[PDB]
């Protein structure tokens, strides 16, 4: 039971980006929904 | 002819003004 | 009571005007309704029997004749024993009974009226149809009559440009040239052999019919070998057979372009027919003058409402309407709306500056000026907006390649070149890794804005030369001097 390293975080919201397609607007709308539920939440937040 | 525009030009002119 | 009886009395009024209502739509339409069932349930279901009385259609319009009536007695017959051996189609079974029902309702109404029986156009009196003017019916008059010439030439190309381009393929080339060639010359030779084009068009349109309708429903025989099928592989030559629209099968054809190009090809048939019945009044007036002083002359009529503002926006449009859709253009955001952009601030200020005051051996000049600068700019990137999307769909040159070269080509793809844009088509892996890293908007097509300019600047191009405005400079030079 551990707190996330900033470079997990980091990874994980990078990966967010690119998971859409050039395009679907709904793949960005998407895209864009995932990564703002994310930044609600500091690493101090987070427990793996 | 031409005397015939120029009176007609001098009295559109004038009442355009007014 | 009364008051019943003045109820029946409006009862009966209301009754009448229904009556002169569907009178005036049996004579003025006559196949229009039928044509588009045709066409709107042709979409619906494309299955032969609407090949042999689609061709027939279209020769009907090459065949201007009163021989046209035999085949008007033909779509009065065809679809009734066709529909009665594979037995809304239904209700067109009684439709075209409704046609002897037409023709019997004018043997009534031959016996009622002591007038010769002629067709009537216009119903109420000749004299208002020839005022053009204000206050009534005269206005759907209008609408009707100037159909005949003026405004139906304008209506016509409007139609005809504004679809055709926002189907944005194939068909877009061609009518490119057409428009290229239409708005470059003026003249009626040249509409003669507009007249020997749009006989072409109209065997070109059961052409494309049967290109949609190639084959039955599918017994996979032939289709074309996909035009040559090239060397690549790729849905880019897959779209470069949804581009030369030779057989393709798995396709859902899409209603709206068959739609679109019927009833616009229709519609400038009867257009360029009547065209060539009259003469006309728009440039023989300048040839006269050309053979400062503008001498057509008429009276100023009265400002009695509508036509007081009507007469007043249209003085107005010069400034506001047709710049305002440039500037629609100029929010367009791309490399080709920027020359929009140092045009129209300069026009802004040259001309006001230029024709506040009449500029003297210069006025013809500048309406050449006008003209050429605001009709070949929108028809150069109207022309290259569908070549170019063209190009984005195929293959050549390929943008993906080396370092400098992947910089510069991706730079030019950047500004120029840009993406395709059509409703149906599809991309591989690698094409998808390259948009990724170049990106795109997605969002280029020309029927926001470039649509309603041009319309307005062709529509007042025929004007800006023509009709009264010609007699509104002295309005503009006695203001300056006042």
Redesign the interface.
Known sequence: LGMIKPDQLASLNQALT?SY???DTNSILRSRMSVSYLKGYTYEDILI | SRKLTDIRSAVDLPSLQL | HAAGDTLVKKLHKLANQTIELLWRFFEVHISKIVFVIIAIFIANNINALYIPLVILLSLAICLPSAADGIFSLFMCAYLFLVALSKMGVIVSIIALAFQSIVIYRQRHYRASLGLPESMRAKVFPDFHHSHFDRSLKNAIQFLIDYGFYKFGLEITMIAIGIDIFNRMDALAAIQCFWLVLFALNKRVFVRRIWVFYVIYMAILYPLQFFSYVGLPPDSCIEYPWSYWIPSYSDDARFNLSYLLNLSIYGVNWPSAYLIGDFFVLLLASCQLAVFRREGEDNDSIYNDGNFENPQYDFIDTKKSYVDYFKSFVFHYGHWITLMSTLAAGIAGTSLFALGYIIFTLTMLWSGNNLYVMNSTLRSFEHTLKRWNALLGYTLFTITMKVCLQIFGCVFLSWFDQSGGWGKTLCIVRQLFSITCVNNECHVLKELEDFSKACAVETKEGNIGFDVIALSFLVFQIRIFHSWYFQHCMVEYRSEVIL
Do not use: Q
């Open positions: 690119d397609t050039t395009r």
